[PDB]
């Protein structure tokens, strides 16, 4: 069998009304989630968000939903996002590279959505069940 | 929109 599951990556950003003491101009939020009706927790062990080295403790882990990071900053950047699976064999994880871009002052808030598709060939019985409970479909 | 410099 071959099982396909959908992931949704996305982010929001907007100008703060008041810059922080550090000079951070924006609030933003990044997320990994399933499409409507899909609880990806069935097959996702954790999501690791790799922030820019300019952030303290840049490696941010969510072991359970919502898989997200809420932060404040002054600039956008490329954010590796690793999704780890509740799997006993390969693939154990997948790494997306996510563009966390901010809006320029005067322009509308960012509200970006990105749909990803994962294909698993011949998963174990145990892992197949997890994928199907998360809204996976055989292909 | 400002972005964090790579170099």
Curated annotation (Swiss-Prot), chain A:
Q: Where is this region: Acylated histone binding?
A: 52-54, 74-76
Q: Where is this site: Acylated histone binding?
A: 99
**Domains: entry comment:** The YEATS domain specifically recognizes and binds acylated histones, with a preference for histones that are crotonylated.
Q: How does it assemble?
A: Component of the super elongation complex (SEC), at least composed of EAF1, EAF2, CDK9, MLLT3/AF9, AFF (AFF1 or AFF4), the P-TEFb complex and ELL (ELL, ELL2 or ELL3). Interacts with ALKBH4. Component of a SWI/SNF-like EBAFb complex, at least composed of SMARCA4/BRG1/BAF190A, SMARCB1/BAF47/SNF5, ACTL6A/BAF53A, SMARCE1/BAF57, SMARCD1/BAF60A, SMARCD2/BAF60B, SMARCC1/BAF155, SMARCC2/BAF170, ARID1B/BAF250B, MLLT1/ENL and actin.
Q: Which disease is it linked to?
A: A chromosomal aberration involving MLLT1 is associated with acute leukemias. Translocation t(11;19)(q23;p13.3) with KMT2A/MLL1. The result is a rogue activator protein.
Q: What does this protein do?
A: Chromatin reader component of the super elongation complex (SEC), a complex required to increase the catalytic rate of RNA polymerase II transcription by suppressing transient pausing by the polymerase at multiple sites along the DNA. Specifically recognizes and binds acetylated and crotonylated histones, with a preference for histones that are crotonylated. Has a slightly higher affinity for binding histone H3 crotonylated at 'Lys-27' (H3K27cr) than 'Lys-20' (H3K9cr20). Acts as a key chromatin reader in acute myeloid leukemia by recognizing and binding to acetylated histones via its YEATS domain, thereby regulating oncogenic gene transcription.
Please give the name of this protein.
Protein ENL
The source organism is Homo sapiens
Swiss-Prot record, chain B:
Residues bearing N6-butyryllysine? 4
* Positions bearing N6-methyllysine: 4
Q: How is it modified after translation?
A: Acetylation is generally linked to gene activation.
Q: Where is the lipid attached (N6-decanoyllysine)?
A: 4
So which domain of life are we looking at? Eukaryota
- Modified positions (Citrulline) are 3
Carrying Asymmetric dimethylarginine, the residues are 3
Sites of N6-lactoyllysine modification: 4
- Residue list for modification N6-(beta-hydroxybutyryl)lysine: 4
Which residues carry the post-translational modification N6-crotonyllysine, per the record?
Answer: 4
Question: Where does it live in the cell?
Answer: Nucleus; Chromosome
* In-chain residues carrying the UniProt-annotated modification N6-glutaryllysine: 4
Q: Where are the N6-acetyllysine modifications? A: 4
Chain positions with N6-(2-hydroxyisobutyryl)lysine modification: 4
Family designation: Belongs to the histone H3 family.
* Disease cited in the entry: Glioma: Gliomas are benign or malignant central nervous system neoplasms derived from glial cells. They comprise astrocytomas and glioblastoma multiforme that are derived from astrocytes, oligodendrogliomas derived from oligodendrocytes and ependymomas derived from ependymocytes. The mechanism through which mutations lead to tumorigenesis involves altered histones methylation with gain of global H3K27 methylation, altered Polycomb repressive complex 1 (PRC1) activity, aberrant epigenetic regulation of gene expression and impaired differentiation of mesenchimal progenitor cells.
The UniProt function text for this chain reads: Core component of nucleosome. Nucleosomes wrap and compact DNA into chromatin, limiting DNA accessibility to the cellular machineries which require DNA as a template. Histones thereby play a central role in transcription regulation, DNA repair, DNA replication and chromosomal stability. DNA accessibility is regulated via a complex set of post-translational modifications of histones, also called histone code, and nucleosome remodeling.
Describe, as the record does, how this protein assembles with itself and its partners.
The nucleosome is a histone octamer containing two molecules each of H2A, H2B, H3 and H4 assembled in one H3-H4 heterotetramer and two H2A-H2B heterodimers. The octamer wraps approximately 147 bp of DNA. Interacts with TONSL; CHAF1A; CHAF1B; MCM2 and DNAJC9. Interacts with NASP; NASP is a histone chaperone that stabilizes and maintains a soluble pool of Histone H3-H4 dimers.
Q: What is this protein called?
A: Histone H3.1
Q: Which organism is it from?
A: Homo sapiens
